[PDB]
Amino acid sequence: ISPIETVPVKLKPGMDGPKVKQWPLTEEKIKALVEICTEMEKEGKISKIGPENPYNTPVFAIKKKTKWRKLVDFRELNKRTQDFWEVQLGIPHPAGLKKKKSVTVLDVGDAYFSVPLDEDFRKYTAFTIPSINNETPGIRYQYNVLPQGWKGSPAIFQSSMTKILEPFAAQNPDIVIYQYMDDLYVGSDLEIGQHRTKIEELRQHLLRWGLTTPDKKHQKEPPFLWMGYELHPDKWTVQPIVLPEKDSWTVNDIQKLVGKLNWASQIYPGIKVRQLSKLLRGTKALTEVIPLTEEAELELAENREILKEPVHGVYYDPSKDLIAEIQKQGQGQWTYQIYQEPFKNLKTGKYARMRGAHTNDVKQLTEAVQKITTESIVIWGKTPKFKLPIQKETWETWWTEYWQATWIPEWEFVNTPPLVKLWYQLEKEPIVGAETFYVDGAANRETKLGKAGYVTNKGRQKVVPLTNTTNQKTELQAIYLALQDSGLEVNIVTDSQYALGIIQAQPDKSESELVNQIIEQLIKKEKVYLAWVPAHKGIGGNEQVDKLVSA
């Protein structure tokens, strides 16, 4: 049976076929292998070969607790076979499908065994059925079709199925045919009767090419449980998420937990996973017990509250607009919904990455819009309209003053607190009448001891001692000291490019508590101007604090 063209297959350059010896088997397994192999030989899937085939691959027989299954271990051959065009790794997302009036699942029976294998390659699939106690030579076989477990079977089967479907699809443009592994998914808007007729036509075509489909009425009806999804006629959702309850948690338990939460976040709005991944920050052995943080406990509890209610998503309509909304979830965490109709979400999602030690709400919002843009291009092939809780003044000021280039989509402001805002803004010019603090900090790089001090133009000077610190942290601590001992308006002069860079970025959240305290001080201020001078240049003001903090 070779109406299907074979795909030319080569071994990796410089490699020969596998010669793995056959493990001895029990008499019952040998009997099962003999009967199965005679049935396959009648069907043309395998052929007995002469004695001059030097290659061999181990064979096995098992029955998972009635039917017997033959299994072949192609690990060596797979190591020795060429690479293929990568079979589809990413599955479609259910929110990208268009609602169909009639829908059908066709499971292809014995898919791989229905496609012929390249002739010149068949010799490398040789295997041996062992004789009883090695009295006589075992039986030598080789495959004529795509073996189950071989490296090239999925890609070659998919290609062959595509070429087989091309004519039928050409004669039926009103029928949508998807292929995935050994499954076909057929959809149409025709009448249910003539839809069944078209399904029967496709079944007869595939059968003419040697591919069997569900002979009776097809065993699979809605809802379809597929890859952790429930696919209903008018909606889709995820299969039920079950979060474990444990006294102690290992790295593995937390990894699977954040995995299930990630999986739920695509339709359940409000899922948070930041504190638990913070528990995974150590990244050590999978059996190491990790103690849960209070924030992780609260996070998991809120997630349990969210997963208590059932949620579902709808399918896509190309004639309606695509809309995305973003809401702030708290400390650096964001949630979003993508929909076409007000309360019918296509899907949901989250964004909680800092991608840096410090950031602000506007930057994170822009990054979330970026992620939604990429996901929308992937799933629907277009970018959505954005409804965002930020005003044009805030965002325009930010992206205008931002040193880095950014792409701002078209969006309408939706007044739904909490709104995204600039908690503070540094001054662009020095402040008249405000006290000028010259600040400096230093630390002994061996003893880790240090100090932070200031000298002002009013004649005020101060030094505060510090233990277990570094020079950069003493620079930040000096800025903080100036903020603490100043009025509502203050000019600050520093020689640290590190601290200057941290403050100029204008963050409103940080991983270090010192920068958080500086942020609170800045929010409580009215006007703050920060200036920089090169160190050890005798500028004046800076030299006094340098000599003061060095002494």
Partner 1 sequence: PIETVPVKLKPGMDGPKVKQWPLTEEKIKALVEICTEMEKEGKISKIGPENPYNTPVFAIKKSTKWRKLVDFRELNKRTQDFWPHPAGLKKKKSVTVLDVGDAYFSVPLDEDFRKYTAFTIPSINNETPGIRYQYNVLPQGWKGSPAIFQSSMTKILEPFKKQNPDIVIYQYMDDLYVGSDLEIGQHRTKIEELRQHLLRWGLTTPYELHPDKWTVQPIVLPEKDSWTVNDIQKLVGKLNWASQIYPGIKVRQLSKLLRGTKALTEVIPLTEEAELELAENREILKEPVHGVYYDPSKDLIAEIQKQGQGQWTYQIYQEPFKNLKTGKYARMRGAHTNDVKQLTEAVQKITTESIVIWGKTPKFKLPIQKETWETWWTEYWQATWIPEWEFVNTPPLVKLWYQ
Contact 180, 107 (CB under 8 A): no
User: To the nearest whole angstrom, how small is the minimum distance from the Cβ of residue 155 to partner 1?
Assistant: 4
Cα within 13 Å of Cα(240), Cβ side: 4
DSSP for 142-170 reads EESBPPTT-TTHHHHHHHHHHHHHHHHHH
State the binding partner of 204 from partner 1, ligand 9KD, none, CB within 5 to 8 A by kind. none
What six digits make up the tokens of 198?
């078209």
Q: Which does 119 bind (CB under 5 to 8 A by kind): partner 1, ligand 9KD, none?
A: none
Q: Rounded to the nearest 10 degrees, what angle do helices 294-306 and 251-264 cross at? A: 40
Is there binding between residue 83 and partner 1 (CB under 8 A)? yes
Spatial distance between the Cα atoms of 131 and 140, rounded to a whole number of angstroms? 11
**79 contact choice in ligand 9KD, partner 1, none (CB below 5 to 8 Å, kind-dependent):** none
Q: Are 145 and 116 in contact (CB under 8 A)?
A: yes
379 binds partner 1 (CB under 8 A): yes
**79 contacts partner 1 (rule: CB under 8 A):** no
233 binds, among partner 1, ligand 9KD, none (CB under 5 to 8 A by kind): ligand 9KD
State the residues that interact with ligand 9KD by CB under 6 A: 91-94, 97, 99-100, 103, 105, 176, 178, 185-187, 220, 222, 224, 226, 231, 233, 315
Q: Is 258 in the site for partner 1 (CB under 8 A)?
A: no
- 436 sits near partner 1 (criterion: CB under 8 A): yes
Residue number, nearest CB to ligand 9KD:
187
Q: Describe the crossing of helices 392-401 and 361-379 by its angle, rounded to 10 degrees.
A: 100
Among 170, 242, 405, 551, binds partner 1 (CB under 8 A): 405
| Residue 364 interaction partner, one of ligand 9KD, partner 1, none, beta carbon < 5-8 Å per kind | none
The CB-of-258 to partner 1 minimum distance in angstroms stands at 22
455 sits near partner 1 (criterion: CB under 8 A): yes
Give how far the C-alpha of residue 300 lies from the chain's centroid of Cα atoms, to the nearest Å.
Answer: 20
Q: Please give, one letter per residue, the 3-state secondary structure of 50-101.
A: CCCCCCEECEEEECCCCCCEEEECCHHHHHHECCCCCCCCCCCCHHHCECCC
If one asks whether residue 93 binds partner 1 (CB under 8 A), the answer comes out as: yes
When computed from its CA atoms, the radius of gyration of the chain, rounded to whole angstroms, is: 34
CB-based contact 41:49 (threshold 8 Å): no
**Which residues within the stretch 322-361 sit at the binding site for partner 1 (CB under 8 A)?**
356
Kindly state the smallest distance separating residue 70's Cβ from ligand 9KD, in Å: 26
Cβ of residue 382: shortest distance to partner 1, in angstroms? 6
Q: Which CB atom, from 40 or from 111, has the smaller least distance to ligand 9KD?
A: 111
For ligand 9KD, the closer of residues 315 and 424 by Cβ is 315
What is the H or E stretch that residue 518 is in? helix 513-524
Residue 495 annotated as lining a ligand binding site: yes
* Chain-centre distance for alpha carbon 66: 40
Residue 11's identity, in one-letter code, is L
- 182 marked as binding residue: yes
84 binding partner 1? (CB under 8 A): yes
d(CA 530, CA 522) in angstroms, rounded, equals: 11
Q: Which does 431 bind (CB under 5 to 8 A by kind): ligand 9KD, partner 1, none?
A: partner 1
Determine if residue 475 is labeled as part of a ligand binding site. yes
Helix axis angle, 153-170 to 192-208, nearest 10°:
130
Structural tokens at position 514: 């010192």
Q: How far is the CB of 468 from partner 1 (least distance, A)?
A: 27
| Shortest separation between residue 8's beta carbon and partner 1, angstroms | 6
Minimal distance, residue 164 CB to ligand 9KD, in Å = 18
For residue 537, the partner it binds in partner 1, ligand 9KD, none, with Cβ less than 5 to 8 A by kind, is partner 1
Residue 297, marked binder? no
Nearest residue (CB) to partner 1, 334 versus 380:
380
Beta-carbon neighbour count of residue 135 at 10 Å? 6
Q: Per rule CB under 8 A, is residue 374 in the interface with partner 1? A: yes
Q: Which of partner 1, ligand 9KD, none interacts with 169 (beta carbon under 5 to 8 A by kind)?
A: none
Whether residue 116 is preceded by a cis peptide bond, meaning omega within 30 degrees of 0, is: no
Q: Which of 155, 243, 323, 414 binds partner 1 (CB under 8 A)?
A: 155
Q: Residue 82 binds which one of partner 1, ligand 9KD, none, with CB within 5 to 8 A depending on kind? A: partner 1
* Sole binder of partner 1 in the list 68, 224, 399, 413 (CB under 8 A): 399
Q: Confirm whether residue 183 is marked as ligand binding.
A: yes
In the complex, the smallest distance separating the C-beta of residue 185 from ligand 9KD, rounded to whole angstroms, is: 4
Q: What number of other Cβ atoms are within 10 A of residue 436's Cβ?
A: 20
Residue 285 touches which member of ligand 9KD, partner 1, none, C-beta under 5-8 Å by kind: none
Query: According to CB under 8 A, which one of 36, 241, 464, 505 is a site residue for partner 1?
Result: 505
What CA–CA distances, in Å, run from 221 to 178, 240, 264, 338, 420? 17, 19, 24, 28, 47
**Could you say whether residue 78 binds partner 1 (CB under 8 A)?**
no
Q: What is the largest CA-CA distance in the chain?
A: 106
Alpha-carbon distance values, 85 to 105, 118, 147, 156, 159 (Å): 26, 17, 18, 9, 10
| 210: region left, alpha or beta (phi > 0 left; psi from -120 to 50 alpha) | left
- The span of 156-164, 254-262, 267-275, 340-348 binding partner 1 (CB under 8 A) equals 156-164
Q: Residues forming the annotated binding site for Mg(2+)?
A: 107, 182-183, 440, 475, 495, 546
Q: Residues forming the annotated binding site?
A: 107, 182-183, 440, 475, 495, 546
